[PDB]
Structures are given as structure tokens and as C-alpha cells.
Design a protein around this nucleic acid. Structure first.
Lengths: 118, 230
RNA sequence: AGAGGUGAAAUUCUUGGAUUUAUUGAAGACUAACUACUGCGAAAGCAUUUGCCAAGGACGUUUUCAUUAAUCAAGAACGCCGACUAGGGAUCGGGUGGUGUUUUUUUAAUGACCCACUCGGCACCUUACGAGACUGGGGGGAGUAUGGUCGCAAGGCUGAAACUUAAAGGAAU
């Protein structure tokens, strides 16, 4: 009965991205980042900004007809921090609070597997 | 400068749903957007390249496949249905991070094998050295010649499990994790080896299309539809 | 319709679509977790697979030669101590024996673990007993005084001195 998108929450420091696409990932439904909701240019990563971004994400997903999302939560990864910023749990909580059902939370940050440091 | 005015792009979007191949259980996996089928980029060829990443638990009803996501590649569109075929397999990262422990060795192998079709697959394997029950030393390392011999028999018997399978036969073989049981039985002569897994299957080349083979993987179908009433 | 980034910012990119997402290609590196008071190497050092090329060490040996040996100035290649007793636990490589479980069978040989012994290693924790006799340098630590020598430093509204001199500024108000 549910229609499933995916969440693609990329929560670095300095910013968060709440970007629902379809089940493939080819077609996007309301990418809104954290720094476009309220910008003091340093509160972009804040839980308030992630809650605002996930809330109007869930507005447009209920508009299009998506009832549930599979959550893919990633950090900046690479040769860098690998820990999700303060916005990841806030964006997930606001997506669940704003009507969308949550399924399949998974951690898809890019572990660099022998990287390019030195 | 001047940027753009918006015109709502969800009025030109069309909903298809994805029918999985019949080497699985319940095969309606979800839906997919595409732009509306106009001339000059019809929607049925705006599709046909998309892979979707589904969970094998969602494809098989159970929860012991809660890891092991798979990829399904859209091949043929008919009647607002996307018929898919197998495109790959991958663990989640948390599964193999949950498997790796210090004071053991991980033997990992991979082989590039061409099946009984002309699909060529890079297929991987991981295995971790167990300790026996009554073992009192804390290490249980393999002596690296046991690693070379274990990796040798892993490569030989899983390249025997491919070439002796098609894609549908290999997929139905690696759903109930039984190539892992073949590796375990063939390798307990050398080292104990807890939790052998396949962990990753990549398509490299795919032969041709063969709509008949895809529709025999799914089921038949042909339409004479409605007629205009004037 | 912003993205980096910062303690905040900024240089930078961006409606000729940045960042995010999906598919794919190319490049140059690198070999994550496994990874250890573990291994190997003469040292610097060495971590993906498979193969080839030579090498090396320890062990096993009722094999062989028979003193062929040890140390280092010169030269060449690469780049709490000792001459000292016993131990103890753990670990790496080899060997012998035991006799249980994983293994298993008439295709080849080949494991893993447990225990005792033994040889050789990287360490660790202890014990007993010994004379162990890219070269150039003033003289302890913490301070104290200074009628010596060498320095640096004060004055006093600026303008403004030969001129009791303008404008403007300062200060106190």
C-alpha cells in the first residue's frame, strides 16, 4: 500500500542534504539542503535547519504521492570524518514526524578502502 | 542576473512499477518516475538503463536476508511494467564490519567467470578463520599457505558453481546461501572458517538482449487493447 | 539555488545548472578494517591476487669436507653494564610422541585443535654473580650588590625659530 522513495540524507559538518529520490535514484523529488532553509551561513548543519529541510521534503513527498522512504544516511566519508553531522538524526526524525513511514536505515558513507592520503 | 520561473515538473511525470524476475518471491518491488512519453525521447527508452537497489529481505519476505542488497536492471517495458533482470549483489557495509574481528584472518577471493550465457561476472568471496571448540590459544591464525590453499579451493569451486549455471540458475543458487555451504564443506579439511559469504557479484559484460529469454524468466504477455469508439 | 570553507568570514564554483543523486569511462596513487609489544630483512625498510626468477633463515639429518675459523683501523656494497646463573607466562617457525574432537570414504598428498618434550627467534616479568679499573669547549646550580668600562634611555604642549608668530590640532574642560 506504501509507495517508497529513498531519503539520501547526506549530513556533513557545515551542511545537511535531505534529498528524496525514487527507488532507482535517477529521478529526484525535492532536494532541499540545510543552508537554504535558514542561513546564518553557520547554522546550516544545525538540527533546526535539518528539521526544516526534512519537513518541506516530506511536504513535497506527500504532494507527489510517496508514503514511505528507505533511509540512506551518509557522512562526508572519503579521506575524512566518516561521522554524520548533527543534522542526520534531526532530518531522520523530522521525516518520520512529518507523516512519512521510515524503512531500511543504512549507512552508506564512502569508506575509502586504501585511500590517497600520502 | 535573471534566473527562471517555475512550471511544476510533476505534471509531466509518469509512474511505472518494477516487476522483478521470477527467481525470487514477491515481485512487485515499487514504482518509478519518468518523464511523460513524448516524441523525441519516449519514456520506454528514457528507461531501460536504470538499475534499482532493493533489499533481498524485501524481495524474499524473510529477515535473514536483511543485509545483501541486490541490483535489478530494467530491460523491457511493456504496459506500464518494468521487467527487470539480475544486475549484481552487494552486502551492506555494516555486515562485513560486523564480521571483521581481530585475532583471526580474513581470506578473501574473487574470480572473473563467464557463465553458460555470455554474461561475465566478477564474483567475490570472504571467509574468516574460526577457532575450534577446546582451542585455548587466543589467536587462530592461518599460516598463509593455508590461506593460499583455501583461496585456491574457493576460486576453483566457485568457478565450478558458475559455468554450470545461467544467471537465473546462479541467482536461485545464491539466494539460499548454499555456495557458502559448498565452500565450508570443501574447506573444513584445511581450516575451520566461520561465516563464509559471497558478499559481492558484479556484471561486467552482458551478451545481447533476447526478449524471449527475459519473457521466459518472467511470464508471457501480448495485448490487443481497446479501440476508439467512433 | 545555492555549494565549499571557517570560531565567524573570505578567495573559489554556480540558472552556459554548482552542490546532491544515478549510470559509465579515464587518470594517477594507495593497499582500509584483518594489523599484534606478531612476521621477514644486514640496515634504511616491507602489507591486494596469481605466476615466474633467483635468494634467505630456523628445524630434521647414523649426508659430506675437515680447521677451512672470531674481531675490526684502511677499502667496497646498500642506505646499570658483562665474560653472567637459573627460571615463568604468552607468542612465531620446525621437529618428536600421546590419543580425543573436528576431519574423513579406493583419485593424489595434505590439515585444524588439545597436551608434554625439544631446537631456534621477537619481546616481556623476574632472579644470582662479576672489577666493570658530523670538528671547534668553559666549568656547578640558584641568586645579590655595583662611585669601574661600553651602550640605550629623560626633558617638555606641537606649529615655533634668528621671529613671544598665524591656521589647525592636543590637553584639561
Amino acid at each position: 500500500s506504501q509507495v517508497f522513495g529513498v531519503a539520501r540524507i547526506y549530513a556533513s559538518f557545515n551542511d545537511t542534504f535531505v534529498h528524496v529520490t525514487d527507488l532507482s535514484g535517477k529521478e529526484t523529488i525535492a532536494r532541499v539542503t540545510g543552508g537554504m532553509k535558514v542561513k546564518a551561513d553557520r547554522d546550516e548543519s544545525s538540527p533546526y535547519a535539518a528539521m526544516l529541510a526534512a519537513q518541506d521534503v516530506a511536504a513535497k513527498c506527500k504532494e507527489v504521492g510517496i508514503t514511505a522512504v528507505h533511509v540512506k544516511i551518509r557522512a562526508t566519508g572519503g579521506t575524512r570524518t566518516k561521522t554524520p553531522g548533527p543534522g542526520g538524526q534531526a532530518a531522520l526524525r523530522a521525516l518520520a514526524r512529518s507523516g512519512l513511514r521510515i524503512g531500511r536505515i543504512e549507512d552508506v558513507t564512502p569508506v575509502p578502502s586504501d585511500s590517497t592520503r600520502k | 542576473g535573471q534566473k527562471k520561473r517555475v512550471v511544476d515538473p510533476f505534471t509531466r511525470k509518469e509512474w511505472f512499477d518494477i516487476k522483478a524476475p521470477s527467481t525470487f518471491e514477491n515481485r512487485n518491488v515499487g514504482k518509478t518516475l519518468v518523464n511523460k512519453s513524448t516524441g523525441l525521447k519516449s519514456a520506454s527508452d528514457a528507461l531501460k538503463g536504470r538499475v534499482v537497489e532493493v533489499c533481498l529481505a524485501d524481495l524474499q519476505g524473510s529477515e535473514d536476508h536483511s543485509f545483501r542488497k541486490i541490483k535489478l536492471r530494467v530491460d523491457e517495458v511493456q504496459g506500464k511494467n518494468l521487467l527487470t533482470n539480475f544486475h549484481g549483489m552487494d552486502f551492506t557495509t555494516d555486515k562485513l564490519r560486523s564480521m571483521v574481528r581481530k585475532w583471526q584472518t580474513l581470506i578473501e577471493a574473487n574470480v572473473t567467470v563467464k557463465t553458460s550465457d555470455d554474461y561475465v561476472l566478477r564474483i567475490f568471496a570472504i571467509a574468516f578463520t574460526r577457532k575450534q571448540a577446546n582451542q585455548v590459544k587466543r589467536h587462530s591464525y592461518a599460516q598463509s599457505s593455508h590461506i593460499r590453499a583455501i583461496r585456491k579451493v574457493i576460486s576453483e569451486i566457485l568457478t565450478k558453481e558458475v559455468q554450470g549455471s545461467t544467471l537465473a540458475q546462479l541467482t536461485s543458487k545464491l539466494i539460499p546461501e548454499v555456495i557458502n555451504k559448498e565452500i565450508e564443506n570443501a574447506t573444513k579439511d584445511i581450516f575451520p572458517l566461520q561465516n563464509i559469504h559471497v558478499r559481492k557479484v558484479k556484471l561486467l559484460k552482458q551478451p545481447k538482449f533476447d526478449v524471449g529469454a527475459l519473457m521466459a524468466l518472467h511470464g508471457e504477455g501480448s495485448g490487443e487493447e481497446k479501440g476508439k469508439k467512433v
